[model samples]
Target: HAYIVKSSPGENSELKSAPAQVEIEFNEPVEEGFHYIKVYNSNGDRVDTDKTEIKKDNHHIMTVKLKKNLPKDVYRAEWNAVSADGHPVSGVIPFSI
Candidate 1:
């Protein structure tokens, strides 16, 4: 199992309601390395966070559990990963709670 994430269609990144888990689908297999998915509160506070978890499928998809509940407001998902090509890749997606 692997974790995959889609760089586009990020419009759904916003979560008005608290979700049990945060997930993303990658178009390709991400090289195994020190990766993380971080959740931030509107106040620039760390909320729930996780390390990438393998989710096997046609594409590598990863899921991580949040350590705490997200309040109603703006939120963000920041990710850091290494591509299979050994290239470092990272990006952030903004959403609301």
Candidate 2:
């Protein structure tokens, strides 16, 4: 699985606040494996669990939700997903909170 982060906001960019969900679109179909998604606050602390979820869309888009309204700070979203061929890939998106 060759992982790639297709799109996301940047760390210093002023984006709209509290986007209900953070989305990462994959280039291919995800295989049977342990996929991981983690969001960290500016202070490098983990924010929430259960924010990650897999969508059944043909494009294989995964949406990670924040537990509560994220404060106006910086954040890092990291994720890993395996392709149908059993290859693993990962990436990180650092954006302003």
Candidate 3:
């Protein structure tokens, strides 16, 4: 098993607007597939496009896209991944618009 790492936009972030993409990282490189990153709005409605993948150039990073020009509101992103050792992982990313 691997340790969950930090992320961009931060766990305690308040952005001026929605980010182009959101990401999560792990202490070790995880399998690129069999992972997910989801964003939810204040209403608990899914706001992300449901697309996630590890960056080829930066193998430890996984990212997802969001809906365009989202209105200002608190949002939470949840993610899960399969460790290279075949362990399961799950975490949350936090921020506000």
Candidate 4:
């Protein structure tokens, strides 16, 4: 129950246009600090901006804006977050753009 519940572009998804941002939703409220959301290109280079904005009203949601438009290729979303109980969780979401 403590994992990513929803994501923008979704898992194993193919898209024609680059998304403006990556959004991840969790089933439960995450901890206030030490949360990270990063997007990596096909070549394993981090392509997302430095800032990952967590929703003020919804601690379960986190987003990262794209620094530049991505070219056509598969990308990976990696996230690490602390659960409400202070457990660290991490996972990967892959998609195409």
Candidate 5:
């Protein structure tokens, strides 16, 4: 099973500015087309670009871009992926902008 080793904005963080993207690094490569991260506002509205990128050369890292100039809000990044071994990996990371 894959475990997240690092993440952008971190858990329970407060950012002074909007970040262009959210990223997370896992202990193992994820299955292609089965990995993604979604960002949502407190109201549960998707605020991301709807595109996820898992590094071609380093599949352990998955990322998603957010909309520009996000208004002040607390957001949650929900991530889900299937590990190479077919195990599920997922979690929520909440932060404020």
Candidate 6:
């Protein structure tokens, strides 16, 4: 099964300001080349600027930088990753700004 252990600007969050990026933690080390996180606005448009990146220091962590300050609205991050054994995993994180 897939794992999404944690997230920044976390699930069901009500933030007073926008976060610079989205960070996610996994239960196991993920494969580097086949991971991505996409932040979508309420309108269904992607807002994440850069490609997802597995942290060099921690393969269990992944992050994607947003386009600086995002406007107030609800957002959801949808992600896909491959496990070390090449199994596909996916999940979503929902939050508000």
Among all candidates shown, the one with the greatest TM-score: 5
lDDT of each: 0.63, 0.69, 0.83, 0.86, 0.90, 0.89
lDDT (Cα, 0-100) at 82 in candidate 2:
83
Model 6: per-residue Cα lDDT over 1-97, one tens digit each: 4487888978888888879999999888898777899999999999999989999999999999998789999999998899876789988889998
**In model 4, which range of ten residues has the least summed lDDT?**
1-10
Q: Write the per-residue lDDT of candidate 3 for residues 6-83, one digit (tens) a residue.
A: 787789798986687888778998886678888898899998885787888876888888889988898888888888
lDDT by residue for model 1 over 1-97, one digit each (tens)?
2334453215446555577666667666775567667767678887665555756553255566775566777767777777666677766777766
lDDT of 6 at 31: 87
TM-score for candidate 6, please give it: 0.91
Residues 1-97, model 4: lDDT tens digits = 3688899979999987878888999898887688888889989999898688789989989888886778998899888888887789989989997
lDDT of 1: 0.63
TM-score, cand. 2: 0.78
Q: Which model is ahead, 2 or 6, in terms of lDDT?
A: 6
> Model 1, which residues run further than 4 Å from truth?
1-9, 56-59
**lDDT per residue as tens, model 2, 1-97:** 6555464554345668775666766777775357767888878898756746677655476766766787888788887888867777777788785
Per-model TM-score, in order, reads 0.74, 0.78, 0.87, 0.91, 0.94, 0.91
Looking at model 2, residue 55 earns an lDDT score of 78
Which candidate would rank higher by lDDT, 5 or 6? 5
At residue 7, what lDDT does model 2 achieve?
A: 48
Candidate 3, superposed: residue stretches over 4 Å from native:
none
The prediction achieving the highest lDDT against the true structure is 5
lDDT of 6 at 33: 73
Q: How many residue pairs clash in each candidate?
A: 10, 1, 0, 0, 0, 0
TM-score of the candidate numbered 4?
A: 0.91
- Per-residue lDDT for 27 in model 4? 90
Segments in model 6 whose C-alpha atoms lie over 4 Å from true places? none
Clashing pairs in 1: 3-60, 3-61, 3-62, 4-25, 4-26, 4-60, 4-61, 5-25, 5-26, 6-25
